[PDB]
Amino acid sequence: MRIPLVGKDSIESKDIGFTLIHEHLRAFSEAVRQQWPHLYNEDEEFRNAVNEVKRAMQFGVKTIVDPTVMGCGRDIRFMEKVVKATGINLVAGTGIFIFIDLPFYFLNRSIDEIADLFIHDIKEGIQGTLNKAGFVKIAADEPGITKDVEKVIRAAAIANKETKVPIITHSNAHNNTGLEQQRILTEEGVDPGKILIGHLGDTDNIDYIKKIADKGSFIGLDRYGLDLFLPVDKRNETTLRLIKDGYSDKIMISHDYCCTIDWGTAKPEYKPKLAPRLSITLIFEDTIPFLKRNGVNEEVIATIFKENPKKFFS
Amino acid sequence: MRIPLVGKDSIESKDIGFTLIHEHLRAFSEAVRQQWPHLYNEDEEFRNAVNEVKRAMQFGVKTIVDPTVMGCGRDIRFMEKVVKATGINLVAGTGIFIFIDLPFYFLNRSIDEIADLFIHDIKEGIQGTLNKAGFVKIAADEPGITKDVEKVIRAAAIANKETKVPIITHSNAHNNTGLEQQRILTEEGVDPGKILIGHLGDTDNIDYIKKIADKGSFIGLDRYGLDLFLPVDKRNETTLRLIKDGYSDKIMISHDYCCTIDWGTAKPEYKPKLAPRLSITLIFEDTIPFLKRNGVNEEVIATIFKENPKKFFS
Ligand SMILES: [Co+2]
Ligand SMILES: [Co+2]
Ligand SMILES: [Fe+3]
Ligand SMILES: [Fe+3]
């Protein structure tokens, strides 16, 4: 049985079904929450996560992959509770989410030591439980590929080669961080088809997106649930274009919706069209209807949400 | 009653007695410990902290100030347990320990919001307890005064003006971060005598140290318990020189000893002389004996370890 699930027995990858590849039940800074618990309400976070997951299931979602890892408040016990309340298939991961430097812990420590943490979570279990990690998550953003960012990428490659689990990335779509992640990983012997380069939906630079897809990795059109770089309308145009041009077998779509997130609220921007309701089901309300009425058939939807995740985890 | 104590009623500053102004019962990365608890042993950390505190008390230490804050694993409940086991007067603080950027939580949040966290810990209590913070801790290092580092400095000034608690800093002695911290704080209306500029013992650049002292702030010769920038022998020479030159009333001495720390072990260096045993009592075994046999009298020791802390907290 291929894929470990939180609070359940492992499943064969062929049985993953309709999958959301990048969603967060919760996201927060470990340090802030430890130091100022008065800012947080776990009961509200729990209710929000359960409600969102239930709504996803009502649209036919069978499996959710949650790439919350170190730096963003991964909590396997919170996750297992959401599973108990919903019955969702939930895939947890391991990894480190940094943009610049590692925590002081990692002073004088090797790439192998970092990889050992990942392999621990994959082979032994997460945070003292028998729930195992099913993928590795890594990140890079505006600061680019720093020394420490590269250390983490190389550690992810070691983990993949040992355990065969895939790698999901966070990138900044407006620099070449995604291309660099793919290059470094494949140089270190990672199968390109075992990599999802994240947040490429944040740009409309189609040639850059296709370049990564052509090199054999999945491309993450994965932030439909954030009011980030690109509006939903323009994301949809980019998604449609890539489908028209034959890239369905590389496309992965998700919301990157955080059922709760601890970030401060940004100044709101109002456009001619009423802002879309951001949630874990926006693609069922907006994106998928938009695609269907623009001529893309059911086989495309099945490819993106079923076949592609199956391959990724195979 | 001026100064709040962990697990005890507050004390008048005049009763603080012989004080170690900068020690850590424990230090670790919140994120690393949350994600990989298998790396840590709280029972060993507890035994180490209790043992060290007891040994300090055997040399006449009455009060320990512990500037462990966000980023370095402050845990008020661990602290209160050490107090119960030892009877030490322990002063806990609030603040943020960063060198570059704030956690993602602080995106779109103001300096006033940051200050509110500090004031919460000072006026209401720490981590859901009635133990209150008695000072603010801030940091800057090799990256210098970044945007976010400056935000935290300015928030500390607001907290001081509202609550009158002093400010302890971490600086890098080989750039001008300490001088910059002092300048920014005093510009924002902080009394220079309510600031301890930390880690100046890391350099032998006496003119730089005196410059900060002359501007009215305490100078931290405060890393006797680390095998860091400067060896103990050279620290001792610098300490003696400053005393000879009349700076006793600005000098604060401590170890910055971490009874446990989670950092990887650096490559050892062996010198002609047997390496000193690093602990929370090294100054009683090495530094203070060295000073005494070089002619500095008991009044100097009383000034540094009793009178200076009294003023700082007055
Ligand atoms: Co991301
Ligand atoms: Co320091
Ligand atoms: Fe994400
Ligand atoms: Fe320290």
Side-chain angles (χ1 to χ4, degrees):
Chain A
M1 266 64 93
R2 295 291 304 126
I3 313 172
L5 296 181
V6 181
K8 297 189 182 186
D9 298 321
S10 67
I11 59 162
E12 295 295 315
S13 52
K14 64 174 170 56
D15 296 314
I16 194 178
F18 194 112
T19 299
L20 293 180
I21 197 77
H22 191 139
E23 310 292 345
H24 299 271
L25 298 184
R26 197 167 60 155
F28 61 86
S29 162
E30 293 92 339
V32 176
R33 187 170 194 134
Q34 173 167 336
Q35 296 310 333
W36 294 290
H38 75 276
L39 299 171
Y40 295 85
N41 184 353
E42 179 180 356
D43 307 79
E44 184 181 9
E45 291 163 344
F46 180 69
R47 287 178 177 286
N48 286 349
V50 167
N51 285 346
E52 287 299 302
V53 168
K54 282 180 178 176
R55 296 196 313 100
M57 289 173 80
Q58 291 164 6
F59 280 106
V61 175
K62 185 177 189 181
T63 303
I64 295 174
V65 179
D66 179 338
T68 310
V69 299
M70 191 225 83
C72 299
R74 179 186 66 170
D75 185 326
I76 200 67
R77 291 173 177 72
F78 180 87
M79 291 167 96
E80 171 152 8
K81 292 174 180 172
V82 171
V83 168
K84 284 175 184 172
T86 63
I88 193 74
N89 292 341
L90 184 67
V91 190
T94 186
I96 290 168
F97 191 100
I98 57 155
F99 291 171
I100 307 179
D101 286 354
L102 282 164
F104 302 117
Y105 170 80
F106 292 97
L107 280 170
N108 296 307
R109 297 191 188 280
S110 68
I111 294 172
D112 288 310
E113 272 186 273
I114 301 172
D116 285 345
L117 297 177
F118 302 166
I119 295 169
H120 171 103
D121 287 354
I122 295 160
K123 287 188 180 180
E124 300 186 48
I126 298 165
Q127 294 167 315
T129 77
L130 294 181
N131 300 294
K132 294 177 185 187
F135 61 92
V136 183
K137 172 67 177 293
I138 66 177
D141 205 277
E142 184 279 317
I145 308 296
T146 67
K147 179 179 188 295
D148 280 358
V149 160
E150 187 196 58
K151 287 188 202 168
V152 171
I153 297 170
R154 291 164 65 178
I158 295 174
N160 160 262
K161 288 187 289 184
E162 176 67 17
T163 70
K164 309 302 184 181
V165 304
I167 299 169
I168 297 175
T169 88
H170 168 113
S171 83
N172 183 303
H174 293 117
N175 66 18
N176 290 308
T177 44
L179 196 69
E180 283 294 280
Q181 292 166 334
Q182 178 187 52
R183 175 182 68 73
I184 297 168
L185 287 172
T186 60
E187 285 187 10
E188 291 292 354
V190 175
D191 177 351
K194 274 286 183 184
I195 311 166
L196 167 60
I197 302 295
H199 303 337
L200 292 180
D202 294 359
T203 187
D204 59 2
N205 182 347
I206 206 75
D207 288 347
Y208 176 66
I209 302 173
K210 289 181 179 176
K211 181 172 182 177
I212 291 164
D214 284 343
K215 281 182 167 288
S217 297
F218 294 102
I219 53 174
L221 314 185
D222 56 18
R223 277 180 149 175
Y224 269 107
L226 301 190
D227 54 6
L228 192 100
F229 279 121
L230 206 62
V232 174
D233 62 294
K234 284 296 145 290
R235 287 173 179 279
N236 285 344
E237 295 298 347
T238 296
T239 301
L240 178 61
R241 172 68 196 255
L242 286 168
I243 290 167
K244 290 176 170 180
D245 290 352
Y247 281 76
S248 285
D249 65 349
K250 295 286 170 58
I251 290 170
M252 281 180 171
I253 292 176
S254 221
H255 305 86
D256 200 9
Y257 187 68
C258 304
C259 300
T260 308
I261 196 175
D262 66 349
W263 303 354
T265 64
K267 168 279 192 173
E269 183 191 4
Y270 301 108
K271 310 168 182 174
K273 300 293 76 183
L274 174 67
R277 195 171 68 65
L278 301 181
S279 84
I280 204 177
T281 60
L282 181 157
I283 64 172
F284 297 107
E285 303 158 5
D286 191 311
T287 301
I288 292 175
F290 166 83
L291 291 177
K292 279 179 180 173
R293 67 181 164 250
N294 275 278
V296 8
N297 67 7
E298 289 280 47
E299 279 279 351
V300 166
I301 305 298
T303 294
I304 290 173
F305 292 102
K306 294 182 188 175
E307 299 307 313
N308 286 355
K310 174 181 180 179
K311 300 185 308 181
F312 188 58
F313 281 106
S314 289
Chain B
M1 266 64 93
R2 295 291 304 126
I3 313 172
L5 296 181
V6 181
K8 297 189 182 186
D9 298 321
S10 67
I11 59 162
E12 295 295 315
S13 52
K14 64 174 170 56
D15 296 314
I16 194 178
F18 194 112
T19 299
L20 293 180
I21 197 77
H22 191 139
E23 310 292 345
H24 299 271
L25 298 184
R26 197 167 60 155
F28 61 86
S29 162
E30 293 92 339
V32 176
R33 187 170 194 134
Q34 173 167 336
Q35 296 310 333
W36 294 290
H38 75 276
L39 299 171
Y40 295 85
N41 184 353
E42 179 180 356
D43 307 79
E44 184 181 9
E45 291 163 344
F46 180 69
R47 287 178 177 286
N48 286 349
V50 167
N51 285 346
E52 287 299 302
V53 168
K54 282 180 178 176
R55 296 196 313 100
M57 289 173 80
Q58 291 164 6
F59 280 106
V61 175
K62 185 177 189 181
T63 303
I64 295 174
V65 179
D66 179 338
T68 310
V69 299
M70 191 225 83
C72 299
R74 179 186 66 170
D75 185 326
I76 200 67
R77 291 173 177 72
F78 180 87
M79 291 167 96
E80 171 152 8
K81 292 174 180 172
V82 171
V83 168
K84 284 175 184 172
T86 63
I88 193 74
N89 292 341
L90 184 67
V91 190
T94 186
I96 290 168
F97 191 100
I98 57 155
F99 291 171
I100 307 179
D101 286 354
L102 282 164
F104 302 117
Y105 170 80
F106 292 97
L107 280 170
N108 296 307
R109 297 191 188 280
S110 68
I111 294 172
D112 288 310
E113 272 186 273
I114 301 172
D116 285 345
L117 297 177
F118 302 166
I119 295 169
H120 171 103
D121 287 354
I122 295 160
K123 287 188 180 180
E124 300 186 48
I126 298 165
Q127 294 167 315
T129 77
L130 294 181
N131 300 294
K132 294 177 185 187
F135 61 92
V136 183
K137 172 67 177 293
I138 66 177
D141 205 277
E142 184 279 317
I145 308 296
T146 67
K147 179 179 188 295
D148 280 358
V149 160
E150 187 196 58
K151 287 188 202 168
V152 171
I153 297 170
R154 291 164 65 178
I158 295 174
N160 160 262
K161 288 187 289 184
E162 176 67 17
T163 70
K164 309 302 184 181
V165 304
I167 299 169
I168 297 175
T169 88
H170 168 113
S171 83
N172 183 303
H174 293 117
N175 66 18
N176 290 308
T177 44
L179 196 69
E180 283 294 280
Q181 292 166 334
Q182 178 187 52
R183 175 182 68 73
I184 297 168
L185 287 172
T186 60
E187 285 187 10
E188 291 292 354
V190 175
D191 177 351
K194 274 286 183 184
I195 311 166
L196 167 60
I197 302 295
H199 303 337
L200 292 180
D202 294 359
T203 187
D204 59 2
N205 182 347
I206 206 75
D207 288 347
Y208 176 66
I209 302 173
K210 289 181 179 176
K211 181 172 182 177
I212 291 164
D214 284 343
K215 281 182 167 288
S217 297
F218 294 102
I219 53 174
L221 314 185
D222 56 18
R223 277 180 149 175
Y224 269 107
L226 301 190
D227 54 6
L228 192 100
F229 279 121
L230 206 62
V232 174
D233 62 294
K234 284 296 145 290
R235 287 173 179 279
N236 285 344
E237 295 298 347
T238 296
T239 301
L240 178 61
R241 172 68 196 255
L242 286 168
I243 290 167
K244 290 176 170 180
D245 290 352
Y247 281 76
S248 285
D249 65 349
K250 295 286 170 58
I251 290 170
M252 281 180 171
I253 292 176
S254 221
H255 305 86
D256 200 9
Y257 187 68
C258 304
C259 300
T260 308
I261 196 175
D262 66 349
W263 303 354
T265 64
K267 168 279 192 173
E269 183 191 4
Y270 301 108
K271 310 168 182 174
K273 300 293 76 183
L274 174 67
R277 195 171 68 65
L278 301 181
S279 84
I280 204 177
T281 60
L282 181 157
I283 64 172
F284 297 107
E285 303 158 5
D286 191 311
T287 301
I288 292 175
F290 166 83
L291 291 177
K292 279 179 180 173
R293 67 181 164 250
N294 275 278
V296 8
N297 67 7
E298 289 280 47
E299 279 279 351
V300 166
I301 305 298
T303 294
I304 290 173
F305 292 102
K306 294 182 188 175
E307 299 307 313
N308 286 355
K310 174 181 180 179
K311 300 185 308 181
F312 188 58
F313 281 106
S314 289

